[PDB]
């Protein structure tokens, strides 16, 4: 019935899937920021 309706697995799995996405975007965001920072430059 109420087998944890929060299977930590599914919740952990989603959170895991979320962490993976953040990790992948992390360097892109940092690179993007550096690039945006280097690409953006004023003018």
From Swiss-Prot:
Annotated transmembrane regions: 9-31
Compartment list: Cell membrane; Cell projection, Lamellipodium membrane; Cell junction, Focal adhesion; Postsynaptic cell membrane
Protein origin, superkingdom: Eukaryota
Tissues where this protein is expressed: Isoform beta-3A and isoform beta-3C are widely expressed. Isoform beta-3A is specifically expressed in osteoblast cells; isoform beta-3C is specifically expressed in prostate and testis.
Post-translational modification: Phosphorylated on tyrosine residues in response to thrombin-induced platelet aggregation. Probably involved in outside-in signaling.
Known disease link: Glanzmann thrombasthenia 2: A form of Glanzmann thrombasthenia, a disorder characterized by failure of platelet aggregation, absent or diminished clot retraction, and mucocutaneous bleeding of mild-to-moderate severity. Glanzmann thrombasthenia has been classified into clinical types I and II. In type I, platelets show absence of glycoprotein IIb-IIIa complexes at their surface and lack fibrinogen and clot retraction capability.
Subunit structure: Heterodimer of an alpha and a beta subunit. Beta-3 (ITGB3) associates with either alpha-IIb (ITGA2B) or alpha-V (ITGAV). Isoform Beta-3C interacts with FLNB. Interacts with COMP. Interacts with PDIA6 following platelet stimulation. Interacts with SYK; upon activation by ITGB3 promotes platelet adhesion. Interacts with MYO10. Interacts with DAB2. Interacts with FERMT2. Interacts with EMP2; regulates the levels of the heterodimer ITGA5:ITGB3 integrin expression on the plasma membrane. Integrin ITGAV:ITGB3 interacts with FBLN5 (via N-terminus). ITGAV:ITGB3 interacts with CCN3.
Family affiliation: Belongs to the integrin beta chain family.
General remark: The constitutive activation of ITGAV:ITGB3 on neoplastic cells may contribute to tumor growth and metastatic potential.
Role, per record: Integrin alpha-V/beta-3 (ITGAV:ITGB3) is a receptor for cytotactin, fibronectin, laminin, matrix metalloproteinase-2, osteopontin, osteomodulin, prothrombin, thrombospondin, vitronectin and von Willebrand factor. Integrin alpha-IIb/beta-3 (ITGA2B:ITGB3) is a receptor for fibronectin, fibrinogen, plasminogen, prothrombin, thrombospondin and vitronectin. Integrins alpha-IIb/beta-3 and alpha-V/beta-3 recognize the sequence R-G-D in a wide array of ligands. Integrin alpha-IIb/beta-3 recognizes the sequence H-H-L-G-G-G-A-K-Q-A-G-D-V in fibrinogen gamma chain. (Microbial infection) Integrin ITGAV:ITGB3 acts as a receptor for Herpes virus 8/HHV-8.
Free-text note regarding domains: The VWFA domain (or beta I domain) contains three cation-binding sites: the ligand-associated metal ion-binding site (LIMBS or SyMBS), the metal ion-dependent adhesion site (MIDAS), and the adjacent MIDAS site (ADMIDAS). This domain is also part of the ligand-binding site.
Protein name listed in UniProt: Integrin beta-3
Organism of this sequence: Homo sapiens (Human)
Section covered of the full-length record: 711 to 753 of 788
């Amino acid at each position: 019935p109420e087998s944890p309706k929060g299977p930590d697995i599914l919740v952990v799995l989603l959170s895991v899937m979320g962490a993976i996405l953040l990790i992948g975007l992390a360097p892109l965001l940092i690179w993007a920021l550096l690039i945006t920072i280097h690409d953006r430059k004023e003018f």
